Amino acid sequence: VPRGSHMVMLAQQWRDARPKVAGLHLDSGACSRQSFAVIDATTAHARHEAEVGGYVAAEAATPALDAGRAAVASLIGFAASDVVYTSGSNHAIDLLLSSWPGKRTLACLPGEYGPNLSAMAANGFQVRALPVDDDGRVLVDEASHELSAHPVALVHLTALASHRGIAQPAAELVEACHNAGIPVVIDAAQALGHLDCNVGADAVYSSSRKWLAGPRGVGVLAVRPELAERLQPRIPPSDWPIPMSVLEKLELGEHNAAARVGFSVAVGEHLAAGPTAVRERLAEVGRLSRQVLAEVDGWRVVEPVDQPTAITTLESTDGADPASVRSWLIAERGIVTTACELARAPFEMRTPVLRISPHVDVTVDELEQFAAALREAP
Amino acid sequence: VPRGSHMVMLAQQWRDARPKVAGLHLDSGACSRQSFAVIDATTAHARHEAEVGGYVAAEAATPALDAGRAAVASLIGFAASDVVYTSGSNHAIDLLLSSWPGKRTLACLPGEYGPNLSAMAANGFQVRALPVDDDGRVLVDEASHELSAHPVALVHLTALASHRGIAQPAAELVEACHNAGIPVVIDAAQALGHLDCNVGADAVYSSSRKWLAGPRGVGVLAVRPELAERLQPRIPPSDWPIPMSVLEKLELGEHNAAARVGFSVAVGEHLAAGPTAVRERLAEVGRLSRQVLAEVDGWRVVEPVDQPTAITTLESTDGADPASVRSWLIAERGIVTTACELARAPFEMRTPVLRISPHVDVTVDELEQFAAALREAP
Ligand SMILES: *Cc1c(COP(=O)(O)O)cnc(C)c1O
Numbered sequence: 021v022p023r024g025s026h027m028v029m030l031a032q033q034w035r036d037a038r039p040k041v042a043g044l045h046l047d048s049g050a051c052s053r054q055s056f057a058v059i060d061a062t063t064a065h066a067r068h069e070a071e072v073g074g075y076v077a078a079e080a081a082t083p084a085l086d087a088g089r090a091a092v093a094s095l096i097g098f099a100a101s102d103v104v105y106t107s108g109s110n111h112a113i114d115l116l117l118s119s120w121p122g123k124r125t126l127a128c129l130p131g132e133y134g135p136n137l138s139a140m141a142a143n144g145f146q147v148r149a150l151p152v153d154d155d156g157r158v159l160v161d162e163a164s165h166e167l168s169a170h171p172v173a174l175v176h177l178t179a180l181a182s183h184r185g186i187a188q189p190a191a192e193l194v195e196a197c198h199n200a201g202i203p204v205v206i207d208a209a210q211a212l213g214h215l216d217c218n219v220g221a222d223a224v225y226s227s228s229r230k231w232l233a234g235p236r237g238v239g240v241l242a243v244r245p246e247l248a249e250r251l252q253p254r255i256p257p258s259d260w261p262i263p264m265s266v267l268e269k270l271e272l273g274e275h276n277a278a279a280r281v282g283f284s285v286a287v288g289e290h291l292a293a294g295p296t297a298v299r300e301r302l303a304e305v306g307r308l309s310r311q312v313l314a315e316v317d318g319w320r321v322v323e324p325v326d327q328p329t330a331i332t333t334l335e336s337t338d339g340a341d342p343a344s345v346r347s348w349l350i351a352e353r354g355i356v357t358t359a360c361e362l363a364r365a366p367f368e369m370r371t372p373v374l375r376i377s378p379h380v381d382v383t384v385d386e387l388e389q390f391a392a393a394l395r396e397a398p
Numbered sequence: 399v400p401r402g403s404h405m406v407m408l409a410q411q412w413r414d415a416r417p418k419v420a421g422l423h424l425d426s427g428a429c430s431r432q433s434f435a436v437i438d439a440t441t442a443h444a445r446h447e448a449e450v451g452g453y454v455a456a457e458a459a460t461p462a463l464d465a466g467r468a469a470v471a472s473l474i475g476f477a478a479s480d481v482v483y484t485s486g487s488n489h490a491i492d493l494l495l496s497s498w499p500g501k502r503t504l505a506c507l508p509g510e511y512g513p514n515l516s517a518m519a520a521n522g523f524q525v526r527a528l529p530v531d532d533d534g535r536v537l538v539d540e541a542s543h544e545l546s547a548h549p550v551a552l553v554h555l556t557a558l559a560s561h562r563g564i565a566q567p568a569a570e571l572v573e574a575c576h577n578a579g580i581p582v583v584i585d586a587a588q589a590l591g592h593l594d595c596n597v598g599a600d601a602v603y604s605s606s607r608k609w610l611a612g613p614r615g616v617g618v619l620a621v622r623p624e625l626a627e628r629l630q631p632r633i634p635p636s637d638w639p640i641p642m643s644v645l646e647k648l649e650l651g652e653h654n655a656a657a658r659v660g661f662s663v664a665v666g667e668h669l670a671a672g673p674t675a676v677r678e679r680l681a682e683v684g685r686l687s688r689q690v691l692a693e694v695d696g697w698r699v700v701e702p703v704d705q706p707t708a709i710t711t712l713e714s715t716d717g718a719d720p721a722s723v724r725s726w727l728i729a730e731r732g733i734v735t736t737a738c739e740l741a742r743a744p745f746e747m748r749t750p751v752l753r754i755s756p757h758v759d760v761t762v763d764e765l766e767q768f769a770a771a772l773r774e775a776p
């Protein structure tokens with residue numbers, strides 16, 4: 021017996037702070053939609069660069085930039101001074117792993133994001149898999165045993181995977197890993213702004229452009245000071261003249277400053293709307309999605325029906341190619357989606373999937389238009 | 399006997415395509431000023447990301463992105479398909495040097511940009527100095543002898559230094575290096591849009607935000623195919639599943655797409671205005687600057703008076719600190735400048751300098767206001 025949507029003003033306020041969608045956007049897990057305020061804040065900084073000078077404009081923006089660090093810090097339980105800006109989540113993990121001291125061994129999910137594995141390998145890490153259930157959810161007790169008996173230099177948990185909408189039990193794993201005396205890094209690229217990311221991790225990173233609906237080309241890396249000062253940044257070399265802290269070294273480099281102030285506005289908007297309220301809505305968006313897609317011929321829903329996420333993935337039962345379906349949906353029906361290849365999670369995925377990832381604004385009629393379009397798809 | 403300025407409509411068209419400066423901007427070598435068109439083009443893409451989807455918007459922008467590659471390619475004598483987007487010039491040299499095969503030995507100017515040296519070191523290069531005159535200009539014949547007798551895996555020429563406005567004889571050095579059978583990389587961060595960068599180099603890189611007046615957070619790297627396919631990118635590892643070309647690997651990663659289309663508009667504007675005409679104007683801006691600053695007490699001009707560049711640097715003769723002067727000029731008189739520390743060119747600079755780097759729009763009255771303000775400076 022299905023249930024109605026809990027009506028909340030939040031959904032509409034969100035939709036109306038953003039430009040009108042052309043068709044139908046179900047792809048906030050890939051790239052969400054900047055508010056007018058975010059777009060204006062970015063444009064404004066670029067204009068200011070042109071008036072007063074680019075570096076003086078950047079200096080004058082330290083208030084807003086610091087605000088953004090702090091808002092991020094509050095969402096993860098770190099201090100604002102532990103937080104640093106990056107180009108994105110891949111930049112973030114590379115900065116971290118390339119800086120890591122001593123024995124480079126880690127454990128992670130089998131469903132680990134492929135480009136993360138790529139970076140792990142490129143930085144000379146030995147990578148072991150953590151024990152999981154049939155869905156890819158970590159088994160926390162078994163993981164505890166495994167890590168006590170067989171130690172590793174760090175654990176890398178993707179709290180929410182790009183290819184499947186399973187909420188990982190982050191907090192429970194973090195205390196298990198700490199009991200074994202092992203630090204935890206968290207890939208919160210999908211999770212930040214979506215799951216409770218206040219779980220006592222040692223490092224966390226994420227991306228601007230996804231659930232926080234900020235500009236592309238920005239991410240964040242946060243590292244606790246105990247860990248931060250053990251790190252040995254690749255650039256500059258460790259025997260270099262100009263003395264600066266580890267986090268100052270990691271944040272070093274040319275970047276789009278405007279996009280960073282854009283981001284700060286965007287986290288601001290998340291906090292303003294209420295983290296907890298937004299997350300409960302996204303969880304409900306997921307419920308409704310899986311109810312509506314429960315019965316489509318040629319597609320089965322992969323996630324349990326009451327996982328607290330907005331990510332819902334569909335596997336074809338008659339050998340249809342999601343990349344093609346995605347293309348059709350865009351060109352013909354203006355419906356934006358993501359096709360996840362095996363390369364996204366090579367040691368878990370056996371077959372590609374179609375991923376919907378709608379934000380708070382989605383309606384039940386919109387989920388029906390998708391299901392309709394999904395039926396009459398070549 | 400001084401000479402008048404060659405009046406050209408170019409100066410004014412440029413000024414009027416940009417926002418009104420608040421005070422006086424003499425710092426295009428650090429960060430220039432985006433045109434209204436550039437700013438609008440960037441904003442437009444971000445808005446489009448929000449309507450049609452971020453990745454579909456990026457795909458739809460391939461025309462403009464490819465245009466920008468091509469415009470860059472024409473300025474350096476490469477093919478558009480040799481050109482790739484980066485975060486900036488430091489990103490560029492790191493991508494290149496981290497990818498370099500076999501024996502890692504190079505020669506460069508003693509006046510090499512400090513962060514370049516830092517990257518060279520971090521990638522395990524042995525770095526030798528090329529012979530130069532008193533100004534830091536390379537002596538081409540002596541360099542030819544040195545390289546024949548004592549070979550090196552590549553030569554890194556900064557065609558125009560950040561700390562001093564010496565135009566390096568790039569073309570003449572490139573043929574000398576090729577005669578010795580040695581490839582040449584060029585740091586054209588200051589030179590692109592400023593000097594003739596069509597000189598037959600094997601690789602060239604530059605930055606969006608300087609003389610081409612594009613967005614921050616963007617640069618370009620161009621590599622000839624002979625060299626490109628010998629390169630072995632750090633990420634992904636060389637034994638990785640997904641097969642793609644070297645340049646495709648280097649351009650991989652999250653980035654601000656909007657800023658890239660911004661950049662394309664900006665190179666467009668340079669080509670539209672006429673490279674050769676713009677360069678001759680910048681050269682004249684330099685002449686006028688050095689005439690006007692010829693006699694200031696407590697400051698001497700460093701560059702010969704007829705170097706074809708807009709970069710003019712001042713050394714204090716009564717132990718004044720340029721960082722302080724720069725700060726005063728901004729806070730009190732709204733004049734934007736750059737203070738170059740020793741760390742910018744550690745193996746050449748003995749003492750800090752104040753750097754002016756005005757674009758085509760500068761007037762002679764503006765250069766007088768600076769000289770005036772430079773006299774009554776604490
Ligand atoms: C989006 C994604 C990333 C990649 O981050 P970039 O911002 O593209 O560098 C990382 N991990 C997850 C789980 C992803 O969904």
Ligand SMILES: *Cc1c(COP(=O)(O)O)cnc(C)c1O
Pocket residue numbers: 273274427485486487488489511556558559560585587588605617
């Ligand atoms: C500006 C500058 C750079 C640094 O490039 P980024 O865009 O800041 O990464 C490189 N070399 C020269 C000569 C510089 O002036």
